[PDB]
Design a protein around this ligand. Structure first.
Ligand SMILES: [Cl-]
Ligand SMILES: [Cl-]
Ligand SMILES: [Cl-]
Ligand SMILES: [Cs+]
Ligand SMILES: [Cs+]
Ligand SMILES: [Cs+]
Ligand SMILES: [Cs+]
Ligand SMILES: [Cs+]
Ligand SMILES: [Cs+]
Ligand SMILES: [Cs+]
Ligand SMILES: [Cs+]
Ligand SMILES: [Cs+]
Ligand SMILES: [Cs+]
Ligand SMILES: [Cs+]
Ligand SMILES: [Cs+]
Ligand SMILES: [Cs+]
Ligand SMILES: [Cs+]
Ligand SMILES: [Cs+]
Ligand SMILES: [Cs+]
Ligand SMILES: [Cs+]
Ligand SMILES: [Cs+]
Ligand SMILES: [Cs+]
Ligand SMILES: [Cs+]
Ligand SMILES: [Cs+]
Ligand SMILES: [Cs+]
Ligand SMILES: [Cs+]
Ligand SMILES: [Cs+]
Ligand SMILES: [Cs+]
Ligand SMILES: [Cs+]
Ligand SMILES: [Cs+]
Ligand SMILES: [Cs+]
Ligand SMILES: [Cs+]
Ligand SMILES: [Cs+]
Ligand SMILES: [Cs+]
Ligand SMILES: [Cs+]
Ligand SMILES: [Cs+]
Ligand SMILES: [Cs+]
Ligand SMILES: [Cs+]
Ligand SMILES: [Cs+]
Ligand SMILES: [Cs+]
Ligand SMILES: [Cs+]
Ligand SMILES: [Cs+]
Lengths: 60, 118, 406, 406, 406, 118, 60, 60, 118
């Protein structure tokens, strides 16, 4: 329970609902946050604007 | 091996890998006889698990690779994905040892002690 | 009654200018197919690997000491297993080579072993032609892969120019005759990641801008045949953000981004993070895996990532991709009437030629390549022009009237 | 002079609004190509058949009594033809099996015969792997086809989940090793629809939403080779009336419409209507064809419909089609160095392994699938918007002026 | 203040009408993809060649006198080279045939030699079926190629109708069984353009509107296999000037323009210009090359043009192209259980059948063909309509106001 | 077989298959000696054709399959598409018999009679 | 001659000259009428709005 | 030096910068002038409106 | 052969092929002893080159094919593209002979003379 449960949810890779932008998501295999292009599909909450923010909320 | 244990640990709790590295007598995976407290008692259970892994099955817990899945609940941490008994067994030793870490508490002064203490 | 309808007119106009502005900021795209007649085409790189990693005659007692267990020649007790499946001759060479009684181990290195014991382009390559011109082992660059020591034709590295094709057909491409050397294959006494039930080569046709990933993305070519590989170049172009999600460049191990470069980065990060070593074919600084680490950590970890993992490596799309469609076909070598000629020419038996010799022809069917391209669908000019057109539709406005009323 | 030109203006406007209204009612469409980056792909179904329909060691005197003539083992006089082409051993087994002197025929059923004498996945399947995980004969569903008793991997029936691929390459797909059992092949003493000059298997890669039509639409895989099948998913989407002519659903034997479902419906209607029976692989209620009916009516009628007919079955286009493009390639199994290992492992000779063993790898080269889609070309909004634009062109009208003048 | 802005309005309008007029005169085009459901498809032509050019049993002393050196049977001294690689039997037939002691040479002609010594469709063709119906050597038209004497199925010449396919699959196509006759292959004692290390046939699937270019554009089919060739028709349409650069017709040797027709024109012009002769497979009036000219001038010159030249032949794009995508696959012939049947049937040994017999199946997977078409992007109506739309945008003009103000 | 005859019949005339089924003595394909009228005389020619099909060639007219093409003119009804003599022969018996049906007239009371009538 | 001669003519399968609509045609192999989608190409007269009408005119 | 140096330059085959038109270029392999479709790409000077003009300037 | 020489010549200078055809004694490739001037002296060097091509290597200068590349400068005329010694050698004879033609001058009356002149 150390990190939220959305941390383990896959980002909407390759899905376009608008502008693609630099974003970061928690990778549950690397157990750290990784860069990806997010296209405004609010499928879940596993997308952050900063790598550090992602590394605070989701890293543990 | 201990890269995956370090990762199983990072999966469950935020206490940096260093703090367990030379903690007490057993952590991480060193031999002794008397553990200083219960955190160090986990590592003994871990160490005693690796000893059984080597003698009974034929594992090489410090070299071999295994896979594990990190879930939202620490107890949910999964080892079923491993295709061999040996790989499955060691993944559990680390799983058992890492959950047990979550129970016990971290007494700093028991980390990096003198060999005359063990 | 009009001011009560000139503004009602205008209200609905605003809900249209809103729908158009909101659309420009989706940054949409459409995909355009196109044929492109080409006067010439750059010939791809062609990597090939023998399916057998280590020449039997180049395995020393020392190599057998360190790597014998990994190749299933030795059990964990450092001895030739009693469940061996050898002839009389090979076994008595190996049983002597595995006599470590009063033997003292010298240092060992997997990369050195592959480089020395891997198959040699100089003995494999019976003949090579490209566009009439004769090619040599010098035209093949050594590249290390999961198969070990492999060779790339037309690598376009060294600072060498890249070759070009101008016509459709077998004459304007490559033709290589190879001897795969089955008499030099390692005996198979077990099943490991380094053993092979198969004889032949693996081949990958790729752009020079990308590395091979031959164990994953290659094709097979079998001994005893001439194989024809007719190709078509196909170019995919994608858009970067905000329109699309393609990766322009890189900032890891390769100087141009491709899906393969991304995967080799991942595999290397993964092996270091999990084994503290890299395999001899991966880039970086980390120590090379020992034969023990290969068996215990490196092989299982690369297999897992390549077979079972779904999260560790997810690769961003690159902006430029070159795919080669392939149509393979075969005829038999040798005929009954040419077997004895080829035997005499390379000093082998007729049975040998029929087991080891292959010819490979790689060519384009036409200069014509295909392009599938993502194009921006609604530029700024297309945002203003339609705001304009439906101004005249609703309010009956113009560029003139707006200016005048000002 | 203006009212004589405001209405002349308007007359030509009506011949434009007529040309646009008449066009909307053509309900036209255009076709859109598109690449689609996929995070994952559903793995297809993979049906395979041995080219030999009946295991020799499972043919009883009773089976030989009823079906011997159909398999060309017997002539019309119920005896082994003197123009037989058998060895010493097979002939003396068959000549004894065909001794019907004081024999009384028990009942017989083609479906039971195929199910019992057809090749068994449990003996054919030496090994199966999919994405690292080991698979078993339990993962293969029995399906009856013109070849007889066949097996589908990943059928996605039973209520079982369908498998998924996440990366390009051989690791993320299926690998099966099969023994085709040529020692179990039926002797060929004539030419009928149930005899085979060939050894090997037939394979079809299809969506789970459609049945196999393997004798018509499959590919061959030969013993003595490892065959690589690199795939690309390609999705075609069509429009239903009035835009297009695709068939949404069905109301005959299958719960999803595809070209194959349509053809199997037709073939079944055709065999019942013309033979009063169905073949054991077709759906429905009608009685199964006897071995006599197969030879006399069922085989000739299915051959005719499949080869010569041009009118009986014409299939409406379905709205969803999934095609898999395939690039095949091969290497040889076994090498000289692995033959004796495999022989020992399955308890066969080295010559046997080289005649019966095959490996098949089926995989995607990239997650990237292609979509070709029919899109409606002139919606209602596009009918009004252009009536609007050329109102302002001719009469200089507007949404405002129309409202105002009202 | 308005006349100072009604004309400023108009100035910018002129720089738009200029940008649109200048664009119409680029005569641009766009490319349209489309699927086309077909009720039927015209079956292509299918040319095939044996890889062996001359039947050993049809080579006379006279032929060996004139053409022996070209086929590497003789050295420049008119004798069988001591570095011959023959069995006992063939050598003693050839050593006697090459006894020119008191021999006087009769006239010789390469075309006559190919026609007489080339492989005969009547002995090669064991069986042919197309859509249920039995076909014969009469259905194959002789065509001369670089391989010599070849045969085209469904040539659609003679004034014969062209055949049609109506369904997907193997039943609605061609199936031929051929014997390649390796016992009739010429011994290989050297390497020339007329010798072959390979056994089998070369095949090309082409529209009847174009000649074969089989040595360059064909595929291989090997003996010992049944090979499946599943096809898809694909139609490319291009625009002629000024939009595009495609060639409508021709005014050289063939009555329809294609890339192959262009290349055969070039090759013929090139051989006459450089050798003063044509090869027996080329059209025209020029004398046929002698065996000396073949070796000395004709072979090196055609090889050069086909391998090394980049300027002599550059072909204009044709306006219509039909491509057939192909997916090849194989099974083995014969099985152990059918070898003795086929041996008995054609009066050969079992070893022979396994070395010489092949089956070829050529079929479509679906009636559905693809069209990629260049369409004119900006017709006259699209030039006026947008001049019109932005008249109303800038100056607020109309068809009415222009008329009225007149 | 008789599924194709029934179809050849439906190709040429609208008289439902039932009405010929047990008509007279011979229809459809039954044996006797004296036909009641000419419709029943067709079936005898048909029956005598099947008898010849079995004895001379080896056909099985009641089981075997054949193909035929239905054209606009009954006489145009085609049998040339059949690849074997036996299959060609039987297709003609039915062709001959079905055209001959078109000549003769249908006397209802001759359909489903008593066996004492034949 | 029992059914018209257009009954033996193939419908314009897959051909679009406008709206596609439910229609019926005589199949000269089945010797009955069958459903198809007709797209306003008046190539011949073998297309009916009803199955029964087709089964009257063309069935015999 | 008998013919200009642009005579040895490849024409812009298949390249479209506008209307395609009948043109002629010197072929340095045939050593004579040949017909091609030129699409207004002034890459070099090896394109003439007439075959003879091309055969004067470039032939020698 | 002489089709390529004629082409090498057309590559370098505009003097039509006919004018060299039967010029003097040697042109093109005929044997004699005394050349009339230096143009005819080129052909002797050419002819003497073919004679060496036949005796030393084994070439057949009048039948064999070779390739050459025509560049902007006559001296740049390339023969390096030929894959055999024999083919390379003859390509040079013609190259040498064709450049040498460019030096010498054309005296018309030395073309098509009498055999009593040679
Ligand atoms: Cl990966
Ligand atoms: Cl069908
Ligand atoms: Cl060419
Ligand atoms: Cs993990
Ligand atoms: Cs978040
Ligand atoms: Cs921060
Ligand atoms: Cs497990
Ligand atoms: Cs070791
Ligand atoms: Cs190194
Ligand atoms: Cs050598
Ligand atoms: Cs090199
Ligand atoms: Cs392996
Ligand atoms: Cs980099
Ligand atoms: Cs690490
Ligand atoms: Cs849009
Ligand atoms: Cs207006
Ligand atoms: Cs029977
Ligand atoms: Cs059943
Ligand atoms: Cs077993
Ligand atoms: Cs099952
Ligand atoms: Cs068959
Ligand atoms: Cs249904
Ligand atoms: Cs029926
Ligand atoms: Cs293939
Ligand atoms: Cs339109
Ligand atoms: Cs000769
Ligand atoms: Cs002739
Ligand atoms: Cs024969
Ligand atoms: Cs013919
Ligand atoms: Cs050759
Ligand atoms: Cs012509
Ligand atoms: Cs010439
Ligand atoms: Cs393909
Ligand atoms: Cs445009
Ligand atoms: Cs016939
Ligand atoms: Cs019919
Ligand atoms: Cs009608
Ligand atoms: Cs009705
Ligand atoms: Cs040249
Ligand atoms: Cs010019
Ligand atoms: Cs002129
Ligand atoms: Cs050279």
């Amino acid at each position: 329970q150390i990190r939220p449960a959305f941390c383990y949810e896959d980002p909407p890779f390759f899905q376009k609902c608008g502008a693609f932008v630099d974003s970061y998501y928690f990778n549950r295999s690397r157990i750290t946050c990784v860069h990806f292009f997010y296209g405004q599909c609010d499928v879940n909450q596993n997308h952050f604007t900063t790598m550090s923010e992602c590394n605070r909320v989701c890293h543990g | 091996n201990l890269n995956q244990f370090r990762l199983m640990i990072k999966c469950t709790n935020d206490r940096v890998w260093a703090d367990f590295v030379d903690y007490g007598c057993y952590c991480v995976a060193r031999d002794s006889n008397t553990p200083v407290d219960d955190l160090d008692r986990c590592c003994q259970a871990q160490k005693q698990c690796y000893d059984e892994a080597v003698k009974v099955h034929g594992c090489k817990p410090l070299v071999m690779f295994y896979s594990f899945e990190c879930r939202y609940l620490a107890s949910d941490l999964d080892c079923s994905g491993n295709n061999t008994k040996c790989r499955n067994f060691v993944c559990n030793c680390d799983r058992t040892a890492t959950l047990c870490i979550l129970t016990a508490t971290y007494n700093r002064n028991n980390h990096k002690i003198d060999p005359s203490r063990c | 009654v009009w001011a009560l309808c000139f503004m009602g007119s205008l209200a609905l106009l605003a809900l249209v200018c809103t729908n158009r502005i909101q659309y420009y900021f989706l940054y949409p795209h459409v995909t355009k197919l196109d044929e492109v007649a080409a006067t010439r085409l750059t010939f791809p790189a062609v990597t090939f690997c023998n399916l057998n990693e280590f020449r039997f005659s180049r395995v020393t007692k020392n190599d057998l000491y360190h790597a014998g267990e990994l190749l299933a020649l030795l059990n964990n007790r450092y001895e030739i297993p009693d469940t061996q499946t050898a002839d009389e001759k090979q076994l008595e060479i190996l049983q002597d080579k595995a006599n470590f009684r009063n033997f003292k181990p010298k240092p060992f290195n997997m990369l050195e072993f592959y480089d020395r014991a891997g198959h040699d382009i100089r003995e494999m390559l019976l003949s090579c032609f490209f566009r009439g011109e004769q090619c040599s082992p010098e035209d093949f660059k050594v590249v290390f892969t999961r198969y070990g020591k492999c060779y790339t034709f037309n690598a376009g590295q060294d600072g060498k120019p890249r070759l070009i094709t101008m016509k459709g057909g077998t004459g304007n491409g490559l033709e290589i005759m190879l001897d795969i050397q089955q008499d030099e294959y390692l005996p198979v006494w077990g099943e490991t990641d380094e053993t092979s039930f198969e004889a032949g080569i693996k081949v990958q046709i790729h752009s020079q801008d990308e590395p091979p990933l031959i164990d994953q993305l290659g094709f097979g070519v079998a001994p005893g045949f001439q194989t024809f590989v007719s190709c078509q170049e196909q170019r995919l172009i994608y858009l970067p953000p905000p329109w699309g999600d393609c990766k322009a460049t890189t900032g890891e191990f390769y100087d141009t981004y491709s899906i393969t470069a991304c995967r080799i980065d991942c595999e290397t990060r993964y092996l270091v993070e999990n084994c503290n070593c890299r395999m001899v074919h991966m880039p970086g600084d980390a120590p090379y895996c020992t034969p023990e680490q290969y068996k215990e950590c490196a092989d299982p970890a690369l297999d897992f990532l390549v077979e079972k993992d779904n999260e560790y490596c997810v690769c961003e799309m690159p902006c430029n991709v070159t795919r080669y469609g392939k149509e393979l076909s075969m005829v038999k070598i040798p005929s009954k009437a040419s077997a004895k000629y080829l035997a005499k020419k390379y000093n082998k038996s007729e049975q040998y030629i029929g087991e080891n010799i292959l010819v490979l022809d790689i060519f384009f069917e036409a200069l014509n390549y295909e392009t599938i391209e993502q194009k921006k669908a609604y530029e700024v000019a297309g945002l203003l022009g339609d705001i304009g057109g439906q101004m005249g539709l609703f309010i009956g406005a113009s560029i003139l009237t707006v200016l005048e009323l000002f």
